[PDB]
Amino acid sequence: GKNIQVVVRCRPFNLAERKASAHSIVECDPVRKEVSVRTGGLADKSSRKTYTFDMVFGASTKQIDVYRSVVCPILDEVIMGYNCTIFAYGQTGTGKTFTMEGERSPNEEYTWEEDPLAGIIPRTLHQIFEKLTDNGTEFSVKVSLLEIYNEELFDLLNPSSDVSERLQMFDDPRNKRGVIIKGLEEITVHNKDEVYQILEKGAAKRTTAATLMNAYSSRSHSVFSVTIHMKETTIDGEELVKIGKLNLVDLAGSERAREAGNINQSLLTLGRVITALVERTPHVPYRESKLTRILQDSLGGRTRTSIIATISPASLNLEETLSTLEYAHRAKNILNKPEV
Amino acid sequence: GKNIQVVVRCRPFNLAERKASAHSIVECDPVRKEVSVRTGGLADKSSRKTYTFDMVFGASTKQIDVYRSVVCPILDEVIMGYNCTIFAYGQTGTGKTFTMEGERSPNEEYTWEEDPLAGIIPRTLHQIFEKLTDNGTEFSVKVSLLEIYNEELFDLLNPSSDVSERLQMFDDPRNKRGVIIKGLEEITVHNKDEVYQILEKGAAKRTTAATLMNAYSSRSHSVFSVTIHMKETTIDGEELVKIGKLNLVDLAGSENIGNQSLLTLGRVITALVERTPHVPYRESKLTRILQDSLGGRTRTSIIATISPASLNLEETLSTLEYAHRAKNILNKPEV
Ligand SMILES: Nc1ncnc2c1ncn2[C@@H]1O[C@H](COP(=O)(O)OP(=O)(O)O)[C@@H](O)[C@H]1O
Ligand SMILES: Nc1ncnc2c1ncn2[C@@H]1O[C@H](COP(=O)(O)OP(=O)(O)O)[C@@H](O)[C@H]1O
Ligand SMILES: [Mg+2]
Ligand SMILES: [Mg+2]
């Protein structure tokens, strides 16, 4: 048992894999919580590696089910006044952004209920407003969106100023763990719907940075953070002031010279940090990377942390799929159970 | 190079690339025969990267243009009685098979006019029958189709034989440059479009092999060889006996670089272009089977296919470097 949870989500086939005559090599067993991969080469149909995780989601798993099993328990902790983090890890094209943000799909004007393709960020903001409104709590909601590319922090919500200028990050006088990112824009969200316009502004800026600086999303880490100030009151029950925070991280693809070197280095540090938090090993290498330094005040002070590892089912991507499963296995090691 | 030609064919964006709002990072200039890749963001950048080749084919290039430009001169030499080869090299999904055999229109074939989607293989077979009949040449055509996977040969046209059966090569006593592929099926072609029927049998065999032997086509080399026996008679002229051969190779996906067969082919080509002492023909089964071609009097051509999207920047750059190393041409002045 842990406050740290590692799960795997397999996506369905894409057109390119079909056209290449790829074959299915992944088998997902949600009940036993295992994923098995056929790794055979020429004339080898008998070899297949099996891994076990906290949860396993197959190709048919819907958005709402990932939200209910993974995010719900975590948002509960946040509402109680804690700081938590959720990561999306995997090869480019396997579903990280689909999982973290989701899509709207052409159909027009959305009621109030959640779009079936909506991701974690959208559903999270919707629930915060719904839950806090229903219980009479006095609250305020603000979000921020920064991107880490080539080890440099870029604000994706700052209206003006936009161009290039990095943002400065330095340890601030106060109790340890935290850091201060000066200038980082913090947009106040007034209603549950307002989350979609905010994302747009972010996406638009994201594109400008990719085109005029080659800061492609597939090669950068996206940190979307939501902070909640809460104050509830009950007659004959004292008043409580709480502050909660949830970091939703869409990591760079796991598959220039150092540009990719730093990426591999940032992801590997994250692995070191996680595996460390799982084993209790005093001292975790937070400082070894910009990514882990920014989320330090989220991973340290006890809280729930989850990692969603996305993979492809196709033979054409055997190598990266195995790499992703290995990385996930290293983060939190859980033995396979008997009876195949 | 002279007889060795290296060209580039960039494909159009695909659905996945659009839906991801991918950025076009390659520019193809057919007139200057250059390919440029944007590696810098264009606000700082490290500048583009320009390569020059014998020909560059943009995204709008149609099948008939590639044929008219790359194949015609080559088939002319084949009909003269020579051995030639054409390769399609590149990342899975860039157009190797679309280029080498093409596709068929889901409906109306218009029997007499080549399906616009027809690739090099079908067009070639059709032109062979048309040209030799028109000049009254006595001739016969035969074809073979094999795939190489993890250095093992598999016959795709042998109706019998189980899937796990491989072919064994042997040195040909009559020619040091040649090889004998024992038991390789050579189907006689009696008329034009009968090529499609033969291509289907091979595809069915390839599917079986993928299923029962894990020989995935995206990780294998496919070698289609057509042999033409010719006897041309002209009263008051000369009586010519000829044998022509054309090998059409659809290579394994280039992302497979990182077995070594692709690097051995690259080295063999570089050596032929730069005329260096020894050509490493024997360092791979692919170059060994094709040694009879590539050598002696022969025109050789490599069609390198690429993607224009930022999503495949990595593999596209790799392909361009491989193509440049095979035959290095100096960039003209930025003029
Ligand atoms: N679980 C899934 N269900 C449906 N489509 C998915 C799923 N995972 C991935 N996809 C598809 O794959 C594409 C690429 O994944 P998306 O997340 O952009 O990027 P990445 O995997 O690089 O984060 C999307 O267009 C989407 O249709
Ligand atoms: N130049 C091109 N013109 C038209 N379609 C192309 C071109 N290049 C690629 N495509 C399309 O992209 C896909 C490429 O797959 P394929 O032809 O199998 O080649 P790759 O062999 O190198 O796997 C096919 O769907 C094909 O129709
Ligand atoms: Mg993404
Ligand atoms: Mg192909």
Q: What is the token pair recorded at B274?
A: 């730069």
DSSP secondary structure letters along B161-197: S-TT----EEEETTEEEEEEETT---EEE-STTHHHH
CA A175 remoteness from chain centre? 27
CA distances A313 to A26, A94, A325, Å, are 5, 9, 12
Residues of B in contact with A212 (CB under 8 A): 41-43
Chain A positions touching B15 (Cβ under 8 A) are 15
Q: Classify the phi-psi angles of A88: left when phi > 0, otherwise alpha if psi is within -120 to 50, otherwise beta.
A: beta
Q: What is the DSSP string of A132-179?
A: HHHTT-EEEEEEEEEEEETTEEEESS-SSS-SS---EEEPPSSSTT--
Backbone angles phi and psi of A108, in degrees to 5: 90, 170
The coordinates were experimentally obtained by X-ray
Torsion of CA B39, B42, B45, B46, to 10 degrees: 60
Q: Give resolution, Å, one decimal.
A: 2.1
CATH number of the domain bearing residue A4: 3.40.850.10
Residue B44: how many CB atoms within 10 A of its CB? 10
Instruction: With beta carbons less than 8 A apart as the criterion, state whether B302 and B5 touch.
Output: yes
Distance CA B266, CA A92 (A): 29
Q: Which two tokens stand for residue B58?
A: 């943009």
Within 8 A of A40 by CB-CB distance, chain B residues are 214
What is the spatial distance between Cα B79 and Cα B71, in angstroms, rounded to a whole number? Answer: 12
Distance CA B42, CA B58 (A): 22
Distance A100 CA to ligand 3 centre (A): 9
Closest to B148 (Cα-Cα) out of B294, B298, B264, B275:
B264
CA quadruple A110, A114, A116, A119: dihedral positive or negative?
Answer: positive
Instruction: Tell me chain B's radius of gyration from C-alpha atoms.
Output: 20
Alpha-carbon distance of B20 to A311, in angstroms, equals: 18
Can you say how many angstroms the Cα of residue B273 is from the centroid of all Cα atoms in its chain?
18
- Read off the tokens for A219: 């090669």
Phi, psi of B222 (to 5 degrees): -120, 130
Under 8 Å between Cβ of B293 and B85: yes
Whether residue B244 contacts residue B228, with contact meaning beta carbons closer than 8 Å, is answered with yes
**Which residues does B312 contact at the CB level (< 8 Å), separation at least 6?**
B17, B91, B94, B306
Nearest by Cα to A185 from A216, A207, A154, A206? A154
- What residue in A sits closest to B14 (Cα-Cα)? A16
Residues 6 or more apart whose Cβ sits within 8 Å of residue B43 = A164, A212, A213
Q: Which ligand number lies closest to the CA of residue B11? A: 2
- Tokens 């034009």: give the residue: B192
Strands (E) located in A233-295 = 240-250
Q: Using an 8 Å Cβ cutoff, are B42 and B64 in contact?
A: no
Please give the torsion angle defined by the CA atoms of residues A11, A12, A18 and A20, in that order, rounded to the nearest 10 degrees: 20
CA distance B223 to chain A (A): 18
Sheet holding B34-38, edge to edge: B26-29, B34-38, B48-52
- Binding-site residues from annotation of B for ATP: 90-97
CA A76 to chain centre: 17
DSSP string, A208-230: HHHHTT---GGGSEEEEEEEEEE
Tell if the CB–CB gap between A210 and B310 is shorter than 8 Å: yes
B62: tokens are 């149609």
**In the structure, how many helices (H) and strands (E) does chain A have?**
10, 14
Rounded alpha-carbon distances, angstroms, from residue A307 to A9, A100, A281, A328, B317: 10, 11, 19, 8, 33
| Ligand 1 contact via A298 beta carbon (within 6 Å) | no
Which residues are CB-neighbours of A138 under 8 A, at least 6 positions away? Answer: A230, A231, A232, A233
DSSP label at residue A24: B
Which helix H or strand E contains B226, and what residues bound it? strand B221-232
Which tokens hold the place of B14?
């695909």
Total structural domains in chain A? 1
Q: Is A13 exposed, middle or buried (0-12, 13-18, 19+ CB in 10 A)?
A: middle
Give B1: exposed, middle or buried? Use CB within 10 Å, 0-12, 13-18, 19+.
Answer: middle
Structural domain of B113: 1-335
